[PDB]
Amino acid sequence: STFVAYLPDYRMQEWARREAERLVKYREANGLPLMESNCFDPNKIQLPEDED
Amino acid sequence: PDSWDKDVYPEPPRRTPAPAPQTSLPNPVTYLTKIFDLLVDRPVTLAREFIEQQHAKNRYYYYHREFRRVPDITECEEKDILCMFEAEMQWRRDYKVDQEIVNIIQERLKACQQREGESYRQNCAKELEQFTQVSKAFQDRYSDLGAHYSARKCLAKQKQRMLAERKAAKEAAAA
Amino acid sequence: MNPFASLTLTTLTILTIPIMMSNSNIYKTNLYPNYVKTTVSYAFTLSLVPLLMFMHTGQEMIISNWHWMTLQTVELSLSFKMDYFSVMFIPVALFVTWSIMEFSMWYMHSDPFINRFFKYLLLFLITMMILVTANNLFQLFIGWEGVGIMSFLLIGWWHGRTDANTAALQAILYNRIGDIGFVLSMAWFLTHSNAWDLQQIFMLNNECPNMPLIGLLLAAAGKSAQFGLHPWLPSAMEGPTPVSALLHSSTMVVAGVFLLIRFYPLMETNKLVQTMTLCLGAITTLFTALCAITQNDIKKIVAFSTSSQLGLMMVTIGINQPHLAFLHICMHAFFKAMLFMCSGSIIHSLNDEQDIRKMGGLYKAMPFTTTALIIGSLALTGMPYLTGFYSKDLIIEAVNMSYTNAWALLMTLIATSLTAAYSTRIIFFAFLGKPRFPPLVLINENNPLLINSIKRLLIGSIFAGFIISNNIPPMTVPNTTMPLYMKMTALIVTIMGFMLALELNNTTYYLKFKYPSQTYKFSNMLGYYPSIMHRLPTYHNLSMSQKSASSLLDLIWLETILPKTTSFIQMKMSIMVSNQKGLIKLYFLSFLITIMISMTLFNYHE
Amino acid sequence: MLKIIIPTTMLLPMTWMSKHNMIWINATVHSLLISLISLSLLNQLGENSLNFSLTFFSDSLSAPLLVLTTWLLPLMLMASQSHLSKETTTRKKLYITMLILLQLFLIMTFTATELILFYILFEATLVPTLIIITRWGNQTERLNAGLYFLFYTLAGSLPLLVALVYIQNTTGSLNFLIIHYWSHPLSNSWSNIFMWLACIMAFMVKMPLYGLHLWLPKAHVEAPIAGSMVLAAVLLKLGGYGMMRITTILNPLTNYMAYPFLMLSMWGMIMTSSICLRQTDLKSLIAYSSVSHMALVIVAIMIQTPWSFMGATALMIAHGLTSSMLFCLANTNYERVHSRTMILARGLQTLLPLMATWWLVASLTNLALPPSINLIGELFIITASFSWSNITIILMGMNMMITALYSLYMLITTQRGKYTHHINNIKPSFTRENALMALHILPLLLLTLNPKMILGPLY
Amino acid sequence: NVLQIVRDHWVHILVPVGFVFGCYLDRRSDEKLTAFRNKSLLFKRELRPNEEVTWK
Amino acid sequence: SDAPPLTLEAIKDRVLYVLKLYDKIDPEKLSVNSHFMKDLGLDSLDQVEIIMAMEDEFGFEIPDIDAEKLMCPQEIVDYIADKKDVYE
Ligand SMILES: CCCCCCCCCCCCCCCCCC(=O)OC[C@H](COP(=O)([O-])OCC(O)COP(=O)([O-])OC[C@@H](COC(=O)CCCCCCCCCCCCCCCCC)OC(=O)CCCCCCCCCCCCCCCCC)OC(=O)CCCCCCCCCCCCCCCCC
Ligand SMILES: CCCCCCCCCCCCCCCCC[C@@H](O)O[C@H](CO[C@H](O)CCCCCCCCCCCCCCC)COP(=O)(O)OCC[N+](C)(C)C
Ligand SMILES: CCCCCCCCCCCCCCCCC[C@@H](O)O[C@H](CO[C@H](O)CCCCCCCCCCCCCCC)COP(=O)(O)OCC[N+](C)(C)C
Numbered sequence A: 001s002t003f004v005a006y007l008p009d010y011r012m013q014e015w016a017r018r019e020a021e022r023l024v025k026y027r028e029a030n031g032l033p034l035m036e037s038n039c040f041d042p043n044k045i046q047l048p049e050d051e052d
Numbered sequence B: 001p002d003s004w005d006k007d008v009y010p011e012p013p014r015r016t017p018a019p020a021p022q023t024s025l026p027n028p029v030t031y032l033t034k035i036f037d038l039l040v041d042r043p044v045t046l047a048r049e050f051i052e053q054q055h056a057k058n059r060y061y062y063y064h065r066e067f068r069r070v071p072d073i074t075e076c077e078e079k080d081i082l083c084m085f086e087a088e089m090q091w092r093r094d095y096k097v098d099q100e101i102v103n104i105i106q107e108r109l110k111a112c113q114q115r116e117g118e119s120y121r122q123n124c125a126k127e128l129e130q131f132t133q134v135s136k137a138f139q140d141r142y143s144d145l146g147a148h149y150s151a152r153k154c155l156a157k158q159k160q161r162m163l164a165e166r167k168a169a170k171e172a173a174a175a
Numbered sequence C: 001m002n003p004f005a006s007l008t009l010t011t012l013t014i015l016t017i018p019i020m021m022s023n024s025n026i027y028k029t030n031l032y033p034n035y036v037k038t039t040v041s042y043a044f045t046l047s048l049v050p051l052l053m054f055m056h057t058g059q060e061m062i063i064s065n066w067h068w069m070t071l072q073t074v075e076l077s078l079s080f081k082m083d084y085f086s087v088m089f090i091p092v093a094l095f096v097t098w099s100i101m102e103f104s105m106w107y108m109h110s111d112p113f114i115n116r117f118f119k120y121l122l123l124f125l126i127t128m129m130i131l132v133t134a135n136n137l138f139q140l141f142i143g144w145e146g147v148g149i150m151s152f153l154l155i156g157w158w159h160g161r162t163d164a165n166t167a168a169l170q171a172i173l174y175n176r177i178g179d180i181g182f183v184l185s186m187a188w189f190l191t192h193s194n195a196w197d198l199q200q201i202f203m204l205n206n207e208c209p210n211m212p213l214i215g216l217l218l219a220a221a222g223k224s225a226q227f228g229l230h231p232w233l234p235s236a237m238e239g240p241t242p243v244s245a246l247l248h249s250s251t252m253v254v255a256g257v258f259l260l261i262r263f264y265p266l267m268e269t270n271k272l273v274q275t276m277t278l279c280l281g282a283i284t285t286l287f288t289a290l291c292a293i294t295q296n297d298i299k300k301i302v303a304f305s306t307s308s309q310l311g312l313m314m315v316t317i318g319i320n321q322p323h324l325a326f327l328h329i330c331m332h333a334f335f336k337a338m339l340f341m342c343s344g345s346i347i348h349s350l351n352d353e354q355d356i357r358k359m360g361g362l363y364k365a366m367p368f369t370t371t372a373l374i375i376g377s378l379a380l381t382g383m384p385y386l387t388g389f390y391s392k393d394l395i396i397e398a399v400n401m402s403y404t405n406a407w408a409l410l411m412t413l414i415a416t417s418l419t420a421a422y423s424t425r426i427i428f429f430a431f432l433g434k435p436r437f438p439p440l441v442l443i444n445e446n447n448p449l450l451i452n453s454i455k456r457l458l459i460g461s462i463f464a465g466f467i468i469s470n471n472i473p474p475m476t477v478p479n480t481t482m483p484l485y486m487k488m489t490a491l492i493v494t495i496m497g498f499m500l501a502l503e504l505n506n507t508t509y510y511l512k513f514k515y516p517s518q519t520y521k522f523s524n525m526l527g528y529y530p531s532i533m534h535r536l537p538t539y540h541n542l543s544m545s546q547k548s549a550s551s552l553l554d555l556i557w558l559e560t561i562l563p564k565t566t567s568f569i570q571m572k573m574s575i576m577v578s579n580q581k582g583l584i585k586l587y588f589l590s591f592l593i594t595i596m597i598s599m600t601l602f603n604y605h606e
Numbered sequence D: 001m002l003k004i005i006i007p008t009t010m011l012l013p014m015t016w017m018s019k020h021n022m023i024w025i026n027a028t029v030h031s032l033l034i035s036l037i038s039l040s041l042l043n044q045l046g047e048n049s050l051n052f053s054l055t056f057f058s059d060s061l062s063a064p065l066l067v068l069t070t071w072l073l074p075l076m077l078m079a080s081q082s083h084l085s086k087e088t089t090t091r092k093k094l095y096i097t098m099l100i101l102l103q104l105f106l107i108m109t110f111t112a113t114e115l116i117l118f119y120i121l122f123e124a125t126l127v128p129t130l131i132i133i134t135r136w137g138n139q140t141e142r143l144n145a146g147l148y149f150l151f152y153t154l155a156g157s158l159p160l161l162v163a164l165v166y167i168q169n170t171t172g173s174l175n176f177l178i179i180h181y182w183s184h185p186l187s188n189s190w191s192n193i194f195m196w197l198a199c200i201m202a203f204m205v206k207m208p209l210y211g212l213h214l215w216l217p218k219a220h221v222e223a224p225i226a227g228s229m230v231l232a233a234v235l236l237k238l239g240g241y242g243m244m245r246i247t248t249i250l251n252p253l254t255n256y257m258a259y260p261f262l263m264l265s266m267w268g269m270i271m272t273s274s275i276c277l278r279q280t281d282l283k284s285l286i287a288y289s290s291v292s293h294m295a296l297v298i299v300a301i302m303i304q305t306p307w308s309f310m311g312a313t314a315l316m317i318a319h320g321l322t323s324s325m326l327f328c329l330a331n332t333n334y335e336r337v338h339s340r341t342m343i344l345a346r347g348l349q350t351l352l353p354l355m356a357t358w359w360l361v362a363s364l365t366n367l368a369l370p371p372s373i374n375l376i377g378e379l380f381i382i383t384a385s386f387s388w389s390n391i392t393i394i395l396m397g398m399n400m401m402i403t404a405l406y407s408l409y410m411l412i413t414t415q416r417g418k419y420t421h422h423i424n425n426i427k428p429s430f431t432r433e434n435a436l437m438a439l440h441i442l443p444l445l446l447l448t449l450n451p452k453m454i455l456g457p458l459y
Numbered sequence E: 001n002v003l004q005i006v007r008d009h010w011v012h013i014l015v016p017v018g019f020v021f022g023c024y025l026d027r028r029s030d031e032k033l034t035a036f037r038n039k040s041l042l043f044k045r046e047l048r049p050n051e052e053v054t055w056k
Numbered sequence F: 001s002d003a004p005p006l007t008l009e010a011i012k013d014r015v016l017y018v019l020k021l022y023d024k025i026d027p028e029k030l031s032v033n034s035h036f037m038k039d040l041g042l043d044s045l046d047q048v049e050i051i052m053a054m055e056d057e058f059g060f061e062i063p064d065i066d067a068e069k070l071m072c073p074q075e076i077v078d079y080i081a082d083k084k085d086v087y088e
C-alpha cells in the first residue's frame, strides 16, 4: 500500500495542469480564445471538391 | 502566496471593513481570537519554521518536462504506423491538457460563486461567459467520440463539421 | 489564518477520536460511555466559537482540502460548506447528542453492550455531520447512506426480536425508494451541469428543470417520512428510547428538509415543484396528526408528532421560506428530544411499560418529569415566547400571507389544532387521574444523570428561540401587516384543539360504553396503510419472484430451450444412428443407394 | 512480464518437491510474494500501454485484473487447506497444481498482445476449472455442473475462433495495437451482423448474460470453495475484459446490435435480483447476485462511453473481491453444519460475534454503500446509462432497491433471530478464517483512497 | 549441519531465482527492440559526450 | 437499579394478599394449600378472574392452558417462581 501510494506521476497529471496553466496565461494576455473549436488546422485539410 | 500564478487564478482586491464598535460590551470573538493566536497559531508557526530550516539545508529541484511538437494525424499517410503512433500520442496529450484547461475555468467559476455571496448571479457574469465558450469549444472538439476514441475519429468529426459549415455558408450566399 | 476554518474542521475531527480508541483499553472499561459523552460536550463547546464568528460578521467559508480523484473535466474533492446552516445546525445537534448520551448512561445502564451502544451513537453523529457539512453531492450521499446504515443498526439493536429486525429492514426499504430520487438528481446534475459541487450547480441552473428537483423531492420524502413513505418512522420505535430521541425525532429525520433547504436557489425558480412539496407536506402534517390523537403507546404518539412537524417543515419549504424551515428544525430539536427523554423516564420508572392506559397519576409522583413534559408540550403547541413560538407561529402566518393552495392551508390549520389535541391526550392519560400501573411501585427519578440531561434541554426549550432569533441576520421580508383575526389564528386554533380534546377526554370518565366509530378505526389503524401496503405489494412481489422468475423462467423454460432441447435432439439422433442390427444385407443395399446417388447427383453435373 | 510468469511457473516444482506437511506454507508464502511483485504493474502511463515485448503488454485495464488474480491465489490456498486435510499428499499437490496452472493461464490471458493467443489461453482456463469442480466437489450434481460449465462456454467460443482467423485473413493481423490503429467501420450487412455476433456471444456467455446464465448457479454451487472463489472473482471478468478489448473493431455496428443485449441485461438485473429474494440455498443466492452485478457491466460495455468503461472496470474489481468474501463466509458455516440451507443455522451472531461483523461488512459492500468502490462503479454506470436514456433510471433504481433487500435479508436470516436449539457443534472461529476474511476486506476498503488505480484506461 | 537446513529448504529459492531469471529474460528482450532508440521524432536527442545509448 | 431480586416469600405474600382482597373468599378460612373449588366453592368463571388478578398483580400474562390448572395459591406461587427463575 505504501509503494502504491508513492508511485511516480507517470500519468502526467501535474504535467497537464502545468501545461494548461501556461496556455491559459498565454491566451488571456494575447486576447485569443481560451480554447479552440478545431483541434486540427484547416489549412492542412483537403475537403472534397464541392458541396454537391 | 507565490505558489501559483495570480493571473491564471485571479481574485478581487479583498476589501475588508475596519472594526467600528458601538457598544461598550467586550467582544468575545476578539478574546477568543487572541487566545487562538497565543495558544494555536504561534506553536504552529514555530514548528513550520523549524521544518523550513531543515528543508533549506537540503535543496534539490525537479523539472517540468518539455515535449517537442510532432506532425499531427493530418500529415500521416494511410498506413504509416509510426507517424500515426506519434500523432496519436501527441493528440492524447493535447486532450489531457484541454481537460485541465476546462478544469481551471470551472475552478474559477466555483470560486466566484462562493466569493460573491448573494450577488453571484450578477458578479460572476465574466466567469460564466468564459466557461460557456470553453465548454462549447471542448464539446465541439471531443463530444461523442465514445470509448475507443482516437485522433482519426476526431479528424473525421472535424471534417464533417467543416462540410456542414461550408454548406451552411453556401446556402446563405444565395440569398 | 483565521481560526474559523480550523475550528470548524477540528469540531468534526475530534468526534472521530473515540472511534479510533474502539480497540484500546478504554473500550473494554466501564468508563467508555463517559469518555464519549465528554468528547461530545467538548466538541459542542468548540463548535460554539464559529457560531459566534458568524453571528458577529456573517462569516462563511468552503474548504476543499483533499482532492480525491479527477474524471476528465469533473473533479471530485473532499469539500465542506460552512455557511449559516452548517455552523448553526452543528452546535444544536451536538447539544442534543450530549444530553441524550448523558441520559443513555442512565437509561441503558444494565445493557451488557452499552459501550457498543455509545460507539454506535457516536458513529451516527459523525455521519450526520458529514451529511450536513457536505459541499458536493457525493459527500452528501456518503453521509446520507451512513445515517441510514446507523439507523438500521440501532433500530434492530435487540437482534433476537423479530419485530425489531422487521422494522429495521422496513426503514432500509423505504429509504432506498428515495435513494432512487437522490441518484436521479446526481445523474442529471452531472450530465447537464457537469458538476456535483454546489457552487457550479447554482451557477449553471438559473431556471432549473423539473426532473432533478423531482428527484430531490423524492429523496426528501423518503428521508423525512412524508405521506407516501411515512410508515417507517412510527415502526422505528422498536429501537431503544435514546435511539428514538436522537435519530428518529430531532436529528436524522430532518435530513430531507435539509436537502431541500440546501437546494433552495434552484427551487426558488420552479413553481411546480414548490406546489408538489407544499401539497405533500400538507397531507403529511394532517394525516400523521390525525393518526396521533387515538394512539395508546406514548412513543408512537411522539413519533406521529414528529412526522407531523416534518410535514409542517415541508409546507414551509413549499411556500419559499427555507430559512424559516431551518429555524423550525433547530427549534423542534430541543423540545422533541426532551419530550422523548421524559417518555423514556416514565417508561423506565414503570418497568418498561409504554401504554398510557397503564400510567395513572404521575403529576405528583414524578414532579420533575411532569414539569419537563408540560413545558415541552407548551413549546410544541406554539405557546407565546417559548422556543416553539419563534418558528411555528411565524410559519402559520407565512402560509396565511401567501399565494397558497387553499386545501393545503386548511389542512395546515386543522393539523395545528390536532397537535394540541394529542399533547392533551398525552398529558391527560399519563399524568392526571388515578394510578393504573401495577401495585409494586418502582418510581424513582432521583438520578443526577437524568435530571441534568433533561434540565439542559429544558433550558433550551425556553430560551433558545429568543436567543437564536435575535442573533441571526434577517433572511426574509417580515409580515408586518396582518388582519387581527389572521394574526391570532394559530393561538385560536390551538386553544380550540385544547378545549375540544380536553372535553372529549373528560367524557371518558362517564359510566357509558359504546362501540367505536368507523372514523376512530380509520385513525387508530393508521388509515389502514400498513395493513394494505405491507401485505399486498410484498405478497405479490415475493410470489412473482418464485412462481415465474425462479420456477417458470429460470428452472423450466430457460432450461427447456437451450440445454434440454439440445440434449434431447442429440440423444434421439444418437439412438437413430447407432440402432443398426449389424446385418450386412441392409447396409450393403445402403451402399448401392449411395453409389447411385453419387453418380447422378454429383457426377451428372460437373 | 516474465518476471511474474516464471516465478509462477516455479510454484509447480516447488510444490512437488516440498515436504508432506509444508506444501501449504510454501505455496502461500511464495504466492504472496508474487502478488507483491505484481503490484509494480500498477504504474501505468496516461497515453499508451506498457509494451513489454511482441507477445505481452500491460494496460490500465489489465493491471488491476492481474493484481486481483495474483492476490486471489493465497486466499484460495488458505480457504482450501481445511477441507482437504484427510486428502493424500499427492492429491493435495495435484489440487495446488490445478490452482497454479489456473493462475498461470489467467496471467498470460490478461496480457496477451494477439487475440488468437488470448483466445487460446482464455480457453485453456477451462481444463483446470473443470478438473477442480468435477474431482473435488462434494455432491453428485458436480458432474452435471461440469458439463454445463464446459459446453455453455465452448458453444460460445467456437464461433469466435472462426471469426478471429477470418479477421486476420482480411486485415492481416490480430495484434491489438495494429487492430486499434488500423480500425475501420463495420458496414451494415448480414455478413457483418453475423461477424459481430461471433465476436460477442463468446464473451456474453462468460459474463454471463441473462438467458445463458444457467451454467453459473450450477457450477458455482457445486464447486469447492477455491473453485467458486476463482469462478466468481476472475473467470467472470474474462468476458468483460474480452468485450472491452474487442469492441473497437465492432463500431458502428454496435449501436444497433446492442439493443437485445441491453434489454436482456436491464431486465435480467431485476429478474436475478428478485430471484435472490426466494432462495433456500445460501451459496445459490450468492451466485445469483453475481449475475445481477454483471448485467450492469454488460450494459456499461455495450453503451460505449468513457464513464461507462470506468464504471465497468471498477465494478468488476469490486465484485471480484466482494463475491469471493461472501463465498468464503458461507463456507465457514457450511464446514460447521454441512448444509447450504440458509434457515438451518440461525442466530449465529450470538455464537460467532466477529464473523458476524465480517458478514455485515460484506453485505454492506454488496449493496454498494458509499464510498466503497462497488458504489463508485455502480454510480458511474448509472450516470452513463442516464445519459444513454433517462428512463433507465427506473430500472437502475429498482435494482438498487432489490439488491439491498436480499443482502440484508441474507444477513438477518443467518445472523439475527435465535439460534436453532439442536445444533451444538458450532465451534469458535479459527484464526485462519478470520484472517481470510480480513485479507478480502482490507484491500477493498483501501482501494477507496486511490480509486484511479482501478478505473481503467479511460481515467 | 548445513545439509540439515539446505536439503529440506532449497525449494525456498526456486521462486526467488525464478524471479531473478525472469528479470534477466526481460532485459534481453529489450535488446531486440532497439531499432528506434534515439530515433523518434519526440525524443531524438544529441548524445552526451560520454554516453553511448539513451537507454538499455 | 432495577427491580429488587424478588423471592419466594414475596410471591406467596402477594398472592395471599390479592386473595384476601377478594370478597368471595374470606381471609380466615383461606390457606396456602386451599383448593379453589373444593375448599372455597368457586365456579370456573370465578377462577378466571383470580388468574387475571394475578396477572395484573405481577405484570405478566399466564397462558390459558397453563392458567386453568392453577387451583391453589401454592400452585400459583410455584408457577410464578418457575417463570421468573426464583430459587429462594
Ligand atoms: C375557529 C374557526 C373554525 C371553527 C370551526 C368550527 C368549530 C369546530 C368544528 C367541529 C370540528 C370537529 C370537532 C369534533 C371532532 C370529532 C371528535 C369526535 O367526537 O369523533 C366522533 C367520531 C369518532 O368517535 P368514536 O368512534 O365514538 O370514539 C370512541 C372513543 O371516544 C375512543 O376514544 P379514544 O381514546 O380513542 O379517543 C378518540 C379521539 C378522537 O377520535 C377519532 O379518531 C375521530 C376524530 C376525528 C376528528 C377529525 C377532525 C378533523 C378531520 C379532518 C379530515 C379532513 C377531511 C378528510 C375526509 C376523508 C373522506 C374519505 O379522541 C381525541 O383524542 C380527541 C379528538 C380530537 C379533538 C380535537 C379535534 C380538533 C381538530 C378538529 C377541529 C378543527 C377546528 C379548527 C379548524 C380551523 C379551520 C380554519 O368521529 C366522527 O363521527 C366525526 C369525526 C370528524 C370527521 C367525520 C366526517 C365523516 C366521515 C365520513 C363522511 C362521509 C364521506 C363519504 C365518502 C366521500 C368520498 C369522496
Ligand atoms: C481495529 C480498530 C479500528 C479503528 C482504529 C484504527 C486507527 C486509524 C487507522 C485508519 C486510517 C484512516 C485513513 C485516513 C486517510 C489517510 C491515508 C491517505 O492519506 O493515504 C492515501 C493513499 O492511499 C493509497 O494511495 C492507496 C493504497 C492502495 C491499496 C492497494 C492494496 C495492496 C495490494 C493487495 C492486493 C489486493 C488486490 C487489489 C486489486 C486491484 C492518500 O492517497 P494520495 O492522495 O495519493 O496521497 C497524497 C500524497 N502522496 C501522493 C505523496 C502519497
Ligand atoms: C436467451 C439468450 C439468447 C441470446 C440473445 C441473442 C440475440 C440475437 C438477436 C440479433 C440482433 C439483430 C439481428 C439482425 C438485425 C435486424 C433483424 C431483423 O429483425 O430486422 C430487420 C431485418 O429484416 C427482416 O426482418 C429479416 C429478418 C427476418 C428473419 C430472421 C428471423 C428472426 C426471428 C427471431 C429468432 C430468435 C433469435 C435467437 C435464436 C435462438 C431489419 O429490417 P431490414 O431493412 O429488412 O434489414 C436491414 C439489415 N441489413 C442491413 C443487414 C440488410
Ligand SMILES: CCCCCCCC/C=C\CCCCCCCC(=O)O[C@H](COC(=O)CCCCCCC/C=C/CCCCCCCC)COP(=O)(O)OCCN
Pocket: D152, D153, D155, D156, D159, D162, D163, D166, D191, D192, D194, D195, D197, D198, D201, D202, D205, D212
Ligand atoms: C451458449 C450459446 C451461444 C451461441 C453462440 C453462437 C452464435 C455465433 C454467431 C454466428 C456464428 C457463425 C458466424 C461465422 C463467423 C463470421 C465470419 C464472417 O464474416 O463470415 C460471413 C459469413 O457469415 C456466415 O456465413 C454465418 C451464417 C450462419 C452460419 C451458421 C448458422 C448458425 C446459427 C445462426 C443464428 C444463431 C446466432 C445467434 C444465436 C445466439 C445464441 C443463442 C461473411 O463472410 P463472406 O462469406 O466472405 O462474405 C463476404 C463475401 N461474400
Ligand SMILES: CCCCCCCCCCCC(=O)SCCNC(=O)CCNC(=O)[C@H](O)C(C)(C)COP(=O)(O)O
Pocket: F043, F044, F045, F046
Ligand atoms: C369488548 C367486548 C366485546 C363484546 C363480547 C360479546 C360476547 C357475548 C356476551 C354474552 C356471553 C354469552 O352469550 S354466554 C355463551 C352461551 N352458551 C352457554 O353459556 C352454555 C352454558 N355454559 C355452561 O354450562 C358452562 O358451564 C359455563 C357457562 C361456561 C361455566 O362453566 P364453570 O362455571 O363450570 O366454569
